[model samples]
Target: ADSDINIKTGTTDIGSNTTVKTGDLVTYDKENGMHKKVFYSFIDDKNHNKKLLVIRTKGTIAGQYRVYSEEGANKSGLAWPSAFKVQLQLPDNEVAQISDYYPRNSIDTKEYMSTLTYGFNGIGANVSIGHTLKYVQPDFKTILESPTDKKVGWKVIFNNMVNQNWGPYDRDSWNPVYGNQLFMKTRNGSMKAADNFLDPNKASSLLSSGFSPDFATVITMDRKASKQQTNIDVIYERVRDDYQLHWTSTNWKGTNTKDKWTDRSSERYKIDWEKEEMTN
Candidate 1:
């Protein structure tokens, strides 16, 4: 039965310095040892509803990022330095109406890459990238919930918003390519029932779908790396006071790429989200 496949609650550790909540899950390539973890919990937001679902991540291993010239890196056609793609299966046919989220804008090119020190490279700093959260509904089909097959759900992605039209780099196609380690960095968002399904009297099957699915949250990461190890961890909550959402005031919409992140005209359904609030 579908109910028999519900998410379990507790805590679990997947090795390599990574631990995660029980209900969440992890996926990686056995051959390459690329790891990605999905952690989820409920968050109480009285400003909206108390049943908001928040998703976040952690890293168990770090991927080896090869050094590249600034010009070469720019031309590599990498969309993001590191990224996470989360596919959520909603109960029945209900879709999520994204409420509040982080990273309304992509990281600034100037502030995008971080400086790191390596032993052999001397005292100079190498670069590591960052990510943000966004909500998307795709047209692809998924059989994650029912054997009958279904096509309705939400995709919450955490990555750079800016698109770099460098080349036809097709390691994994549209899907995330594991390798680039998420490091210990994190990205998160809060979601509530949408399509008028927010009534308090609604049953768990309808409103609490986030915790009811066989695989409630399926997360994938995208990054480029040659060697080393990578892992992801996530946590769900009922209340989050750690930081408030703060939308960036900087101009992150400037890009020469033909594919714009803000272009939603092709989306199957118009995704409406609340104003982004920066974490503070």
Candidate 2:
């Protein structure tokens, strides 16, 4: 029925021929040793409740690709993604398989070009491009109960809330995965829950509770190496003390992209937070 993509399949042995098939899953990868390619073809929006763990990429090299989050973020955020082992969840006890994460891949452009990189100096390695995604429900129960040791502050415990469950675990689409609804108004319009009591003699002692998701992802790109980070960028939630949610960033300054240690992450959060105060 005229599929959106043509998934070419053939022998990989020497002197082998290849062919293409339509209506196939475009969420996978294909390699030719000399040239590698990926596809991300979604036939339809049938699974409205689907929680996809997407990783988009783009680059100039044959064997390389810059994998990024759904939001075109591959460098970093509130926390580095390299340290993140994000989960791909489903209802009915659906244990995720490897394929569940990125089902397929697609090469948005180009084919196996003989024009070389090392031999003729084509382009360098990987870089960022684009995309957006939604997910399942937000599950805060398990996370809220993690080992909050000495080094782990209340904000740090939930600092990596770029895209995870922070509310009901049940299946829902419109509010799919509670995007970033960190703070909520209690029936009392103050109390967060049982844990809030620990932080305060009464949950109402404080005006609000709970932490929000990452406000921005700070990626220290090697400007000399082509405006891209060496690894996953650092993900930052709101300034723990900036309760009102003031926006700020570590974007490159000096009006030049040639600086190495140009602009860096904020060394200090605005206004001091009470060290003794507990985070919701």
Candidate 3:
């Protein structure tokens, strides 16, 4: 019931007074219609068996997108989150909104230094990181006429440790270790060897538990969204290489977690960034 192109629906002014908020689409009647259709490939999966899509339903808030199937049909959220924000550079070079926010962040800047508990690939853990972000201008403009092309390099020291349970959800009146034992905590200092917990057949032993550090992912935008914000990409894919995680625990940190995480990332492959690479 609306459009995909981000709209201002107002005058261009930096006066915070500008209702320069985002546009929307409503679905009550048949007043909805889209002008163009854009499709993107997966950033890290080769199995194009399914495609992620955005639905441009008609509504004030529905101007964004829904989902599309791998069979090339329109669908809803099965994998990626339902809603997403769009970034558009105003005529004055001011960014409308930001996206692709990581943790320990104020806004969209990747300059972060902290350790937090975050989960990935459906598991839980703590993270410690020290990354240096380096910028390199790529030559996407020569081919696509886009001033947004960008290249980034990083020297990262990232680690993942496990976390405790929900304080409130440890609802059991006498829950000891609080809720740290989510039936999958795998470690809690006197850390029972994770394997032993699942099967008594395995000799129960204490674990020398903790995460070791290693660089996992690093990416660059063929065209930087702008000087202010750059996240995944318009293509729904990221500029990713790949990674493998191998457990180095003298005993075991086999927390669903194991040795070697092979990066099956489907990222930008054919495009040439043509920018000077930086790694410090």
Candidate 4:
């Protein structure tokens, strides 16, 4: 008659230190209303820190245990709770314990460089990929050599180049070049062209191959203007303006990547101008 009845009980009265250790197998018995829970504590010792792993089993189910570190929590902090937790779920029946003391790294102080060139547009704006939208500021050397009187015109051209937009292209889009040889058959081709254009000698060939008449014309004009300059400053300024109007703009670079810019709020637009107006 006793065999026909089932009796289940949770954990037997085991003392606190008697149940837990570095590596212990703990099980939970649902029939007896017992559950398994593990806790960890980190003690900071000025020059170093030590970790304590505590395992508690309440029932008969056997499982694996593991510990994970929480974000923004240091194991070396003097806080009461060491900001660490353990999971009772494991794939295998293995139990692992770690208790090594080490010094924690200090917080990182490196500042992030803000991306100030691109502006966002709101919804409903017509955005395209590969469009030459506008020009960003030229490099410092370029700005210094510009014609003082013609700086306004140079600025307008530079802004136009930097702010230009482009149309979007599909991932595997292909276009014919030189009688259907498949101009830049892959995305890599476009990237290579952009890299080439940033350099002096290869840039001319890249622009020519891409059949960009406007950019080619600017390059030719700048070459001639620089040669005619009596003063070194004049030549430098001319080359700098040309470079800003052509190569250094964010819009031009984004076009190479086949990305589109959305319209941002008025505040964002104003911020773009403020950044562009800063001198070297």
Candidate 5:
């Protein structure tokens, strides 16, 4: 025989914004590490006569069981009122197994190589180059039709450049001016000496130190243009905020190609002193 459980909500005061409401039910099967929840609506003022009913069962594990309760409402204007009763029912005979199983030797050797190639060459190589030409240069279509065998190049120039040791911050060694000058000279010299087909200005802009403003502007303009041209109602505004808080406990660092700080974990912390200094 199954047993019925009567779960009550916290009491509410008259005229006060308090009510005996049900919340989403949560059930955890420890043996299997499986958790489930059920959402249901509460008895409204008009339907107070309706008796809210829910059923639950015990699982294979001694403590693992099902639960039922009321669902929560979205107070914010963003979401609609979805009143659904939450229930989690469990089977009696099945035993749950919990374990952390991860692949040991399934290493992706090509991952680093892939990142390097994509960074050096533009994304979607041929397609991006084609599109770039279509927008950036005048008479682009004609030039692309009969091209002197010239290839596009990309460079990862650093600003306030540190040798992957000082993550994004460590400003003592930061030298954006010198780094930009060096990159400009190198790019210009290459364009003048090697390929007459290549434009120094274009190459410099492409390989410029830090994020390219023209790239951002062009992308934004292109998106606006595409929306206007297609008359698509796809773009929407979203509100978001960023906050920083110091960790009370020590944090573990991780290793990667960028930060080679500690062998235990190659993690670097970013410190922002100046406003909008760390531009992506």
Candidate 6:
């Protein structure tokens, strides 16, 4: 049976091991029962000066979230979940644009940096981002060696190069040239299988893939529960007046200018989890 969704407002922790500081603005929502309801936690920074927010998202399915294909439902192999979507609506007048900037030139190497910016509508309004989504899957050992019996596994999608017009000239010049597509990849690279792909057209991507960098921590099996499979930390920063949100996670390397904004993220920049997992 599912559980009741409870909403609480107060100063409370956001991520595990106190990664994110407990601020006065905190909203906690959870179900009474396990593996039955979606989890959402909204946390605002205590220091209002540093405009920041963290939303913790998770699916409460006891078993791994697996969906059976029409043919697989009877044959029994390679099933995956539907695009379970969730939205993050920024508070009125508190719009957030990606803080990172990308290079505008490739061959010359020296060029101005530009950010793909967007803003949400005011109160009681709905404005959303439809950027080209990029996918990040862990290089789990089990899925690596085994080929035919490929498991879709858990994955996170981030926003990247939406359109040529929306970004600077070198938008497609990322070293690896990230795509507007969602590729189910492992530690080394993408997998090759008929049923092993994810269609980016199916859902809206979460987080930003700007040059400054945004990260998410997905913890499987919380409290050591074998079936407690998803606890995600959506970490990103929001700035008030400044259009550029230049901050990088502590573990990630960045230019001197980007490093200066690290204090805005602080402890939350570090990846802290209870179980072995992937950070993207």
TM per candidate comes to 0.23, 0.14, 0.18, 0.12, 0.13, 0.19
Model 3, 1-280: lDDT tens per residue?
Answer: 1233465543332223222122222212122221212122113222222112121211111121111112211111111111112211212233322222212212223444444455566555656555456433321111111223232111111122122323221112232332222123233323423222322112111111111111112232323333423223221111111111112333222212122211111122221122221111
Residue-wise lDDT of candidate 1 within 154-175, one digit each (tens)? 2222222211223222212231
Per-residue lDDT tens digits for candidate 4, residues 125-230, read 5533342334333211111112222111111111111111232222223333211111112222323222322222222221122111100000001212222211
Q: Against the true structure, candidate 1 has what lDDT? A: 0.25
lDDT on C-alpha atoms for all candidate structures? 0.25, 0.19, 0.22, 0.19, 0.19, 0.23
lDDT of 6: 0.23
Residue pairs of candidate 5 with colliding backbone atoms: 31-96, 38-86, 38-87, 39-84, 39-85, 39-86, 40-84, 40-85, 40-86, 255-266
State the lDDT of candidate 6 residue by residue for 1-280, as single tens digits.
1223344443332332323332222222222111212222222333332222232333321111222222321111222221122222222222232221111112312334444555666645544544453434321111111111111122222223222124321112232332211222211222223233334332222211111111212121123333322322222222111111111221111111111111111111112232322233
> What CA RMSD would you report for each candidate?
25.4, 27.4, 22.4, 35.3, 30.3, 24.6
**What value does the lDDT take at residue 253 in candidate 6?**
13
Which whole-number lDDT from 0 to 100 does residue 8 have in model 6? 48
* Lowest lDDT 10-residue stretch of candidate 4: 211-220
Error of 1 at 114 (Å): 29
Q: What is the lDDT of candidate 2?
A: 0.19
Model 5, global lDDT = 0.19
In candidate 5, position 22 carries an lDDT of 38
lDDT of 1 at 255: 15
Best by lDDT: 1
Candidates by lDDT, descending order: 1, 6, 3, 2, 4, 5
TM accuracy, model 5: 0.13
Q: lDDT score, residue 141, model 2? A: 16
Cα misplacement distance, residue 28 of candidate 2 (Å): 33
Minimum summed lDDT over a 10-residue window in model 3 is located at 206-215
* Candidate 3 segments whose C-alpha is farther than 4 A from its true place: 1-9, 13-162, 166-260, 267-280
Clashes of 4: 36
